[PDB]
Amino acid sequence: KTHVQLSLPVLQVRDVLVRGFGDSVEEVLSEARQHLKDGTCGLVEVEKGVLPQLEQPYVFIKRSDAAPHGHVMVELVAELEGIQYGRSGETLGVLVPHVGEIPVAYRKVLLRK
Numbered sequence: 001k002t003h004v005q006l007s008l009p010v011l012q013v014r015d016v017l018v019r020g021f022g023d024s025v026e027e028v029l030s031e032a033r034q035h036l037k038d039g040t041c042g043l044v045e046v047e048k049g050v051l052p053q054l055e056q057p058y059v060f061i062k063r064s065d066a067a068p069h070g071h072v073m074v075e076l077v078a079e080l081e082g083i084q085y086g087r088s089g090e091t092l093g094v095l096v097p098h099v100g101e102i103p104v105a106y107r108k109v110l111l112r113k
Contacts, residue, residue, distance in 0.1 A: 003110045004036075005071050008061075009103035011042040011096065013050045018097040020055030025078040025085045032059040032076055032095045036111055042098035043107050046091050056080050059095040062088030064112060071110040 021031035035041035043061065044050060051058065057080040065073040066089075076095075077086030092107060 002113060003073070004113050005069065006036060006039075006041075006109050006111055007106045008041060008043040008095075008109060009098055009101070010093070010105040010107055011044055011098065011101045011103055013044050013053045015101045016042070016044060016054070016096050017099050017101065019053070020057070020096065021059055022057075025057050025080050028057045028059050029076055029078050029085070031097075033113070035095070035097055036113075040098050042096050042101065042103070043093040044096055045093045051094065054094055054096065060084075060088075061092045061095060061109060061111075062086070063090050063092060064088050068110055069108075071108045073110045073112070075112045 021028035061074040064075045
């Protein structure tokens with residue numbers, strides 16, 4: 001399938017134990033995709049002061065369309081020193097590894113895989 005229905009745990013930035021996916025744009029996009037597939041990916045909602053508490057490169061999920069079965073269609077865009085790799089809509093949040101942190105909510109997305 002080109003798209004996969006996922007329910008992503010929404011984590012508070014100060015709870016997150018592993019604050020990024022790795023060290024290159026290519027690695028973080030790779031790792032993000034692997035964690036999304038394995039159900040080990042959390043979502044942090046971006047507000048004032050959130051991104052400086054996470055590790056670059058960042059992986060965003062961005063709205064790709066204006067929502068089958070409640071699932072917002074999204075795609076992955078990476079960022080490193082203010083340059084983005086990808087072009088998409090509005091940010092739903094930043095992806096991070098999930099290692100058992102307690103979520104505050106779940107974000108239903110349809111991920112272009």
